[PDB]
Write a protein that binds this ligand. Structure first.
Ligand SMILES: N=C(N)NCC(=O)N(O)[C@@H](CCC(N)=O)C(=O)NC[C@H]1O[C@@H](c2c[nH]c(=O)[nH]c2=O)[C@H](O)[C@@H]1O
Ligand SMILES: [Mg+2]
Ligand SMILES: [Mg+2]
Ligand SMILES: [Mg+2]
Ligand SMILES: [Zn+2]
Lengths: 14, 221, 111, 113, 1111
DNA sequence: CCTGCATCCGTGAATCGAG
DNA sequence: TATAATGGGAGCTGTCACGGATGCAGG
């Protein structure tokens, strides 16, 4: 949905 | 953010700098990685903003110059209570800077504007709709050019075929090439001075034809 | 020949490249000083065509004598500048991307 | 069916997306140029990120941005938010916006002149 | 001349300052004349206070100040500068740890100042900031269009500040709350506020079957913090539910005074609606470590009480002017000032954490550019920032009283709907029900009523006379729409003897609805009939006798009236004609009592009671925005002793202080040989002889000599390949001399530019070689006269570079402007119109002998068609003609107030008195009755217009009382077979003239991409042949005419060049080729990766690009 | 498991002028 | 090329009525 928020989620995993 | 590149564009460019930082890092120095990474990250981001922002791409050093001119003019406008003159900025810039060079620099930094720029408070009009095409020939131009070629051929028929061919080869009406006297003499079979003589006679005949007929005069533009 | 029909169809990648007169490698437009088309840019003359009629970029070939002749030094063909209206370019993507028309037009054709 | 996915994105001829110098010596250009520059930038960066090698997280985001750029070119505002010029709220004019619409190529220039 | 007036109504208060909505608003937002220490918190001051201080080093705000304009007004109009003032700000940088305090005054740029009349100057152009109308902030309850018994609750803050909140009862029983396109149970939000099941049970328990849906055991099972985290997971999915993060978002969304802001008006509206009081302008607060409620509980209370059917709870009309407010110039500029100041604050916060954490000053830390850009944006490319209408003084006067529903935060044209476009009962006295554009903006753009003003909250208030018992007090009370709905307000024309009500049953209003009521039940009374309509609508006499539609036309067209050189005030006025030229700064008056020293066309010098000598420079022949010449004319002589507020110099469109939008002409209402067929108008040549309807128009012609990479552009008298006959009126510098006459094709300013580099075609090379003249290095690019224009050069402004005082935009060497004016007489095609809505064009200019004339030999000026009257239903011009006729022979003017004006019997009386002058002169000169007058009388008594048997003088009087006289056809000498209505009518010459409009094009400029002809007269463009015009040709079956338009006459390049070549060669046009615009379509479709191929019947591809697109 | 109704998203919304 | 720094920021809320696709509970 939101590219910025999605990338922020993919970053919070590590 | 807000410097011409999107948020994600900046992040990815900082990721490039992050990669550069990782490969150039030395752990023996006991420095926390964040310290050495930050430098390369900022460096990659700034390089990206300097390169990708302007539609008309401008070298990084020239951008630093323009931005230096921005901070200079803003410093002066903040102290003088008004917008600075070209000469005032030229002073505060130091040596090598006059009003002329400042104005030139500003002219370079000018960015293009969108052709889809709205005209009016409705959406039925665009900016590019009011811009004529300067390249493609108007029907008047093409017609005039054709009339010039026809009138010139009508003028070259008042000569013989030989003395007109010398001129057609000399100025490049035929084949589209201007020849020296040696080539035209190598073709017709006479000496170069004979060719220059024929071209003098032909031009002089065309002068007398022009003085009498008054036809080609209007095409002088 | 007279036109009696008009066909519309999907363009194959090879057909897209067949249309293209060159790949646009750099997102440059024109030089910030010379105001001339930057090489391998969106306005590059070597790809789309000459700005001046029957004249190449560096000005080595200025006439209609040589037509179809590609300048060796500059790299631009000498023809009518009208070709810059009709000549397609292309961009080879690293990862193949989906044409949004066939993705978002309900009911989705790909879906 | 695999032609519905683009390996090579076409480029419209320069004169149909012109960059011209107006009366005052200033420059004016089409939004398609900014769109294509978006595409080339994100594409070239992806090719570099692949060449030097990068974690799949970074490559993923770069790919997702590439699709966003392709969509922006073909049909702006179609998927999610429209791409705009900095400082402006005005969405760029995409190929879909040029063809379709009441101001489109069909209604404005083809069915009337 | 004598000025006789009518009416029994004595209006107590005079009309308020007409430009007050501009000046008093902007000044209130600035407080520049207010000492900083005594400044209140509004506008610019409120912006500084709301944006300051900056948390994280602490930068604090002290006070601001505004210097004087760097240039005067007329100097800004001249040099294309902006009328503005320097803005300085006192700031003290305070370190929250060290305690270091560094104080300095930073410069934030300039702020545009408003002129006296209420307009602005943006880069050398007068601009009017139009007020905006929008839904007032507060809490409204609108019925749900889906469920009849259920209602929608809406919580609305100021535009751009905070989201809208929707409280709705779902079919599943639970109350929902909608914020930023997100719905959730309101129960959770209530829990975060610190509410419990106890508090909600005792408070809302009055209404059963409702609060049980608000009851949820799983909600009270968690603490306020847990519920807060739960809510953050609802509003912000994917974002980590950190406590302080959730606090920050929710607080910023609701309780934050800086982010979320109700209107001070909306604050009061919410207080009165919910019967409570609000401490701040936020829906909630952050106090003592948690969230405390303010708005949500009383709103939910009212909502449930509304659904249950509990008395004392109503829905809200959103078109009600008690729920609709006005954002004036001051508030609009303030809001944009707030945005720009907020961006500057972001720059401050950014630069504090960067650079030196030790050595920083307020000067270093401040970037003024965001603020400058924001202000400059609002004053330039904003919609509400419009080009000032300087046609006539009334134009700009109305322009400043315009009200728009559009612009930022307003309505989109598609988002409109005609619910808001209609007239409301609350528009009474506030917004004019007549004045509006008949375009797409109808209902959206309106004008403010005369007696109406806007209060501090933003609502429109109207004056009303206090009535207690039968006595009407001279005091006046300005009321809002909500307040007006409380009382019973009678009519202004209700009978009053002294201060006492006379009538037994008066006509009154209760909440808009008319009611016949007793004088004991009358609480208030209309001040004047004039308060119901706008200023322009007040300038129309006999308004009550006109249809509302043509009244709209009259009000709109008076704005379009061009100031004539012989312009005169109307014979029949309404009384506001002087006041208009008063509030508008067209005229000129004396400040105090005194005597006149000097009188000139350039200046007027006056010595006052003070003894001080004041000199007034006069504006003469200055070009306005529309081209109408604005000049002031002296009306006093040397030594004239004047008083306070006496006329010194008449401005544009003004006669002796009164407004002159047209001229009083002798009209005749009769058909005339079909020349007045369908609204057309026939005029006399005499109107041109004595220069009636003649006006001066000026046009501004600019040219720029810039720096090119191919060489400089030089403005000089030297132009290659030109005849001396063409260089006649130029001076030695290339500029045309002042006072010369210029025609289409002539050169205003000569300029040369170096040719673009190109191989001269072999034909040109040979041509140069033959004529023995080398090609000139430069090329002629001269500012010439556009086709259909011209006049006399009155002024030349030349700006350069290197010379003092002037510096142009980068690249430009010198800017030269030429001012060419012209006096325009009335010609066939120009548009004439009156105040009653009657409009038309001049179709014929007859010689004076062809003109229908009076028995005494006086020819009429204008011939109007009677057919235009009945269908259009505007009888005002008829009465204007009657009273104009009586005033024509009596030689006196009149004042007829709207709805209070003169009535028929009085007009009959004045007509009779005029008849005595008419016929009494004749019979005294020894002239009996004409034989043609006898025949006319015969057909008149057959018409039943006069009583049979009476003497001709008695019959001619009977006709004259009806407004009809005997007319003689100038062509025949025979009379018209019937009596015709003749009299003086006030007719205006509108801005729409054939000189500005007429255009024709053979060939010209073509667009870039489409390569089709441009559009408009200015660009020398072609006429648009739309798809409807295509249909017209198709329906006809004219294929080759349509194919012409689609190819040769527009888009086909080769075809049109060969076409033009064919016509000038006498040869027939060539077969049309395939259009370029289709080729554009093909390639644009290829850019979409779609293959488009043209084929033959063999299904073999056909190349329309002729090999140019194939490798 | 398959029909029917509620509901979602995307698409339209007159012409020509000027601006 | 080196103190250490490690999940964003502003939303636009007063059109409307249509076709068609998605999804839901109900027989
Ligand atoms: N500024 C505008 N549009 N004024 C409208 C106007 O003066 N008219 O006379 C309008 C409507 C009457 C009115 N005032 O409401 C009118 O009837 N003009 C005559 C013709 O002009 C055409 C027309 C007028 N106004 C429009 O908005 N669209 C139209 O197509 C119609 O074909 C119409 O038959
Ligand atoms: Mg210097
Ligand atoms: Mg504007
Ligand atoms: Mg439906
Ligand atoms: Zn070359």
């Amino acid at each position: 949905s939101d590219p910025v928020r999605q990338y922020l989620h993919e970053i919070g995993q590590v | 953010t807000g410097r011409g590149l999107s948020f994600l564009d900046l992040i990815q460019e900082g990721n490039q700098g992050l990669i550069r930082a990782v490969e150039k890092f030395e752990y023996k120095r006991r420095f926390k990685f964040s310290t050495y990474a930050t430098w390369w990250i900022r460096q990659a981001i700034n390089r990206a903003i300097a390169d990708q922002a302007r539609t008309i791409r401008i070298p990084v050093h020239m951008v630093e110059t323009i931005n230096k001119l921005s901070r200079t003019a803003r410093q002066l406008q903040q102290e003088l209570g008004r917008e600075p003159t070209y000469e005032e900025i030229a002073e505060a810039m130091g040596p090598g800077w006059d009003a002329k060079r400042v104005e030139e620099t500003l002219k370079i930094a000018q960015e293009p504007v969108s052709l889809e720029t709205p005209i009016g408070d409705e959406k039925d009009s665009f900016y590019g709709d009011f811009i004529p095409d300067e390249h493609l020939p108007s029907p008047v131009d093409a017609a005039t050019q054709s009339l010039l070629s026809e009138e010139l051929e009508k003028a070259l028929s008042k000569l013989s075929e030989r003395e007109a061919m010398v001129l057609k080869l000399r100025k490049g009406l035929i084949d589209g090439r201007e020849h020296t006297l040696e080539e035209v003499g190598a073709f017709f079979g006479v000496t170069r001075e004979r060719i220059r003589q024929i071209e003098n006679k032909a031009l002089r005949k065309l002068k007398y034809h022009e003085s009498r007929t008054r036809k080609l005069r209007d095409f002088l533009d | 020949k007279e036109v009696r029909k008009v066909r519309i169809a999907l363009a194959s990648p090879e057909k897209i490249r067949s249309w293209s007169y060159g790949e646009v490698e750099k997102p440059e437009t024109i030089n910030y000083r010379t105001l001339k088309p930057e090489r391998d840019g969106l306005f590059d003359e070597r790809i789309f065509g000459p700005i001046k009629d029957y004249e190449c970029a560096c000005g080595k070939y200025k006439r209609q004598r040589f037509e179809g002749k590609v300048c060796e030094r500059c790299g631009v063909e000498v023809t009518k500048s009208i070709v810059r209206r009709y000549r397609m370019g292309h961009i080879e993507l690293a990862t193949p991307a989906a044409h949004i028309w066939f993705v978002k037009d309900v009911p989705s054709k790909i879906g | 069916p695999e032609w519905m996915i683009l390996e090579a994105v076409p480029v419209l001829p320069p004169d149909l997306r012109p960059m011209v110098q107006v009366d005052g010596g200033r420059f004016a250009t089409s939004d398609l140029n900014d769109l294509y520059r978006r595409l080339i930038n994100r594409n070239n960066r992806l090719k570099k990120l692949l060449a030097q090698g990068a974690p799949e997280i970074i490559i993923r985001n770069e790919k997702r941005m590439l699709q966003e750029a392709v969509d922006a070119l073909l049909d702006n505002g179609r998927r999610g938010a429209p791409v705009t010029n900095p400082g402006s709220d005005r969405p760029l004019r995409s190929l879909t916006d040029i063809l379709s619409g009441k101001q489109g190529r069909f209604r404005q220039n083809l069915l009337g002149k | 001349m004598e000025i006789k007036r009518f009416g029994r109504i004595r209006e107590v208060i005079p009309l308020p300052p007409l430009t007050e909505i501009q000046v008093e608003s902007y000044r209130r937002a600035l407080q520049a004349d207010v000492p900083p220490e005594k400044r209140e918190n509004v506008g610019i001051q409120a912006a500084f206070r709301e944006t300051f201080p900056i948390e994280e080093l602490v930068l604090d705000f002290l006070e601001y100040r505004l210097g004087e304009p760097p240039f005067p007004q007329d100097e800004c109009r001249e040099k294309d500068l902006t009328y503005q003032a320097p803005l300085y700000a006192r700031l003290q940088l305070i370190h929250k740890d060290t305690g270091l305090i560094k104080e300095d005054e930073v410069f934030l740029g300039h702020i545009p100042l408003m002129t006296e009349d209420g307009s602005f100057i943006i880069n050398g152009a007068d601009r009017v900031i139009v007020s905006q109308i929008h839904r007032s902030p507060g809490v409204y309850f609108t019925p749900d269009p889906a469920r009849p018994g259920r209602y929608i609750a809406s919580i609305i803050p100021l535009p751009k500040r905070g989201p809208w909140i929707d409280l709705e009862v779902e079919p599943n029983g639970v109350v929902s709350m909608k914020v930023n396109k997100r719905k959730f149970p309101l129960v959770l939000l209530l829990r975060v506020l610190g509410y419990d099941q106890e508090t909600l049970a005792r408070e809302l328990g009055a209404y059963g079957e409702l609060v049980q849906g608000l009851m949820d055991e799983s909600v009270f099972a968690m603490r306020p913090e847990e519920a807060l985290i739960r809510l953050f997971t609802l509003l912000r999915p994917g974002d980590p539910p950190k406590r302080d993060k959730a606090v920050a978002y929710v607080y910023g969304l609701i309780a934050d005074p800086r982010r979320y802001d109700l209107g001070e008006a909306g604050r009061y509206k919410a207080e009165e609606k919910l019967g409570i009081r609000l401490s701040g302008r936020t829906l909630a607060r952050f106090e003592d470590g948690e969230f405390k409620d303010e708005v949500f509980l009383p709103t939910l209370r009212y909502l449930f009480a509304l659904t249950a059917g509990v008395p004392g709870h109503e829905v809200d009309d959103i078109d009600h002017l008690g729920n609709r407010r006005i954002r004036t110039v001051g508030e609009l500029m303030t809001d944009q000032f707030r945005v720009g100041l907020a961006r500057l604050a972001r720059g401050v916060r950014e630069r504090m954490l960067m650079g030196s954490e030790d050595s920083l000053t307020p000067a270093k830390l401040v970037n003024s550019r965001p603020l400058e850009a924001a202000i400059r944006e609002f004053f330039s490319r904003s919609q509400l920032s419009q080009f000032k209408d300087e046609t006539n003084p009334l134009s700009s006067l109305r322009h400043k009283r315009r009200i728009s529903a559009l612009g930022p935060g307003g309505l989109t044209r598609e988002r409109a709907g005609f619910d808001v476009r209609d007239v409301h009962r609350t528009h009474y006295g506030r917004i004019c029900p007549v004045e509006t554009p008949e375009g797409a903006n109808i209902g959206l753009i309106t004008s403010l009523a005369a007696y109406a003003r806007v209060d501090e909250l933003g609502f429109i208030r109207t004056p009303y006379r206090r009535v207690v018992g039968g006595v009407v007090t001279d005091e006046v009370v300005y009321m809002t729409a909500t307040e007006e709905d409380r009382y019973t307000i009678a009519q202004a024309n209700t009978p009053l003897e002294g201060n006492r009500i006379a009538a037994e049953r008066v006509v009154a209003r209760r909440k808009g609805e008319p009611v016949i009521v007793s004088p004991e039940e009358v609480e208030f009374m209309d001040v004047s009939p004039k308060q119901v309509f706008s200023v322009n609508t007040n300038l129309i006499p006999f308004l009550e006798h006109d249809d509302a539609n043509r009244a709209l036309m009259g009000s709109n067209m008076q704005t379009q009236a061009v100031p004539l050189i012989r312009a005169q005030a109307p014979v029949v006025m309404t009384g506001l004609e002087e006041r208009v030229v008063r509030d508008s700064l067209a005229a000129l008056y004396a400040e105090e009592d005194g005597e006149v020293a000097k009188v000139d066309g350039n200046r007027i010098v006056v010595r006052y009671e003070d003894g001080r000598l004041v000199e007034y420079p006069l504006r003469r022949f200055y070009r306005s925005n529309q081209g109408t010449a604005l000049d002031q004319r002296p009306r006093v002589v040397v030594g004239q002793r004047v008083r306070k507020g006496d006329l010194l110099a008449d401005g544009p469109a003004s006669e002796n202080g009164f407004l002159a939008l047209g001229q009083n002409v002798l009209v005749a209402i009769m058909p005339f040989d079909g020349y007045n067929f369908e609204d057309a108008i026939v005029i006399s040549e005499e109107l041109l002889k004595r220069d009636f309807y003649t006006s001066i128009h000026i046009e501004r012609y600019e040219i720029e000599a810039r720096d090119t990479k191919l060489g400089p552009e030089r403005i000089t008298r030297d132009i290659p390949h030109l005849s001396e006959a063409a260089l006649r009126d130029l001076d030695e510098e290339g500029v045309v001399r002042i006072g010369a006459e210029v025609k289409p094709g002539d050169i205003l300013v000569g300029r040369t530019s170096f040719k673009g580099e190109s191989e001269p075609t072999p034909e040109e090379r040979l041509l140069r070689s033959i004529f023995g003249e080398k090609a000139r290095d430069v090329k002629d690019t001269s500012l010439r006269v556009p086709p259909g224009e011209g006049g006399i050069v009155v002024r030349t402004v030349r700006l350069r570079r290197g010379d003092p005082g002037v510096e142009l935009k980068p690249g430009v060497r010198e800017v030269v402007r030429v001012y060419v004016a012209q006096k325009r007489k009335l010609q066939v095609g120009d548009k004439l119109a009156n105040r009653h809505g009657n409009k038309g064009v001049v179709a014929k200019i007859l010689p004076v002998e062809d003109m229908p004339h009076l028995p005494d030999g006086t020819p009429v000026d204008v011939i109007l068609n009677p057919l235009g009257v009945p269908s259009r239903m505007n009888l005002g011009q008829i009465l204007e003609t009657h009273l104009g006729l009586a005033g024509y022979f009596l030689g006196q003017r009149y004042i007829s107030p709207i709805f209070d004006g003169a009535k028929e019997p009085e007009i009959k009386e004045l007509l009779a008195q005029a008849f005595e002058v008419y016929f009494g002169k004749r019979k005294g000169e020894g002239f009996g009755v004409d034989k043609r007058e006898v025949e006319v009388l015969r057909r008149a008594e057959k018409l039943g217009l006069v009583t049979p048997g009476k003497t001709p003088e008695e019959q001619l009087k009977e006709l004259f009382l009806q407004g009809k006289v005997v007319l003689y056809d100038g062509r025949t000498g025979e009379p018209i077979e019937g009596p015709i209505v003749v009299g003086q009518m006030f007719i205006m010459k509108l801005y729409h003239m054939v000189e500005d409009k007429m255009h024709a094009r053979s060939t010209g400029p073509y667009s870039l991409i489409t390569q089709q002809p441009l559009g408009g007269k200015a660009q020398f463009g072609g006429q648009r042949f739309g798809e409807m015009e295509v249909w017209a040709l198709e329906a006809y079956g004219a294929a080759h005419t349509l194919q012409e338009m689609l190819t040769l006459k527009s888009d086909d390049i080769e075809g049109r060049n060969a076409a033009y070549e064919a016509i000038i060669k006498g040869e027939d046009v060539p077969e049309p080729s395939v259009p370029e615009s289709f080729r554009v379509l093909v390639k644009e479709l290829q850019a979409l990766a779609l293959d488009v191929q043209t084929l033959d019947e063999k299904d073999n591809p056909v190349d329309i690009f002729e090999g140019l697109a194939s490798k």
